[PDB]
Design a protein around this ligand. Structure first.
Ligand SMILES: [Cl-]
Length: 310
């Protein structure tokens, strides 16, 4: 139905620090014959579940340094790969990927696995999408760990969530250009640019899912959706703001990668005001957009903060 391709399994043979066993679902409702990959780590009977959402242009490999810390605390960790990314299947046409298409998969996943007592861990697209999930079923969400992310609202209601698209030239403009223009997109090169501390090995794990451009339709569409917000995304994101400001009563932990040109402090302080009860942020000076590459410190501090209220 949805024409999609699948990454050969040998592409992930030599992954660095990725000893997690795959789990798949190819029976989600709305996603017929599409196989989704996700990690299920720690005790599968734990009370607490960390749902780790990744963004553009990565996969669950991004949470590889946080996963073990959350699991050792006694929690179950779910880290799904969105369709078009990591080990999940990849639809071939960019038109298949929409805000709701990826949002509905997350609601499908959550219902399917029956996740409860969720600690939402988001960043980037993990957050554009994931911050709109709680209002759908408030009872399954109990905590949030938010790294550089915001809501894809309209420019008027929140200019801070729209300004970064145009300025500065070396921020989101550069980012989108690097991703949607090359006809020969090398994700290892892109990642080493955007996450200067990655080793060669780690950079190649980010390119691992895409043997050639025919596999990167989802990678291509995400930046375009930051640029061109459809009505449903706007409506839903706008309504999530209200949920965070007035309905949210859980615990929150915010961490900012201070070197981020995209969603750094001019985006995160405003986000911090809209999230009821959000405490002071943990500013990580050396981290850029991929805060998770400095993930062990974030996981440990968040658990620390969470223990001093539970
Ligand atoms: Cl993007």
């Amino acid at each position: 139905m949805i024409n999609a391709i699948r990454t050969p399994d040998q592409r992930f043979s030599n992954l660095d620090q990725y000893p997690f066993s795959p789990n798949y679902l190819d029976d989600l409702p709305g996603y017929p014959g599409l196989r989704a990959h996700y990690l299920d780590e720690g005790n599968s009977d734990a009370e607490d579940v960390f749902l780790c959402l990744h963004g553009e242009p990565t996969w669950s490999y991004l949470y590889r340094k946080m996963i073990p810390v959350f699991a050792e605390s006694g929690a179950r960790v779910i880290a799904p790969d969105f369709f078009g990314f990591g080990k999940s299947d990849k639809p071939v046409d960019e038109e298949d990927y929409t805000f709701e298409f990826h949002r509905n998969f997350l609601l499908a996943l959550i219902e399917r696995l029956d996740l409860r007592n969720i600690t939402l861990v988001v960043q980037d697209w993990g957050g554009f999408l994931g911050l709109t999930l709680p209002m759908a079923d408030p009872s399954r969400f109990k905590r949030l760990i938010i790294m550089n992310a915001c809501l894809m609202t309209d420019p008027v209601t929140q200019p801070a969530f729209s300004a970064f698209v145009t300025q500065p030239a070396d921020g989101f403009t550069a980012w989108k250009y690097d991703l949607v223009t090359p006809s020969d997109l090398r994700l290892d090169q892109f990642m080493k640019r955007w996450a200067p501390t990655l080793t060669e090995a780690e950079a190649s794990a980010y390119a691992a899912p895409f043997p050639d451009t025919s596999y990167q339709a989802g990678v291509r569409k995400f930046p375009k959706m930051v640029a061109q917000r459809d009505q449903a995304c706007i409506d839903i994101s706008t309504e999530a703001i209200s949920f965070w400001q007035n309905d949210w009563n859980g615990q929150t932990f915010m961490a900012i990668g201070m070197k981020d040109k995209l969603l750094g402090p001019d985006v995160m302080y405003p986000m911090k005001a809209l999230i009821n009860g959000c405490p002071e942020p943990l500013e990580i000076a050396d981290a850029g957009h991929f805060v998770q590459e400095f993930g062990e410190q974030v996981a440990r501090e968040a658990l620390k903060h969470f223990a001093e209220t539970e």
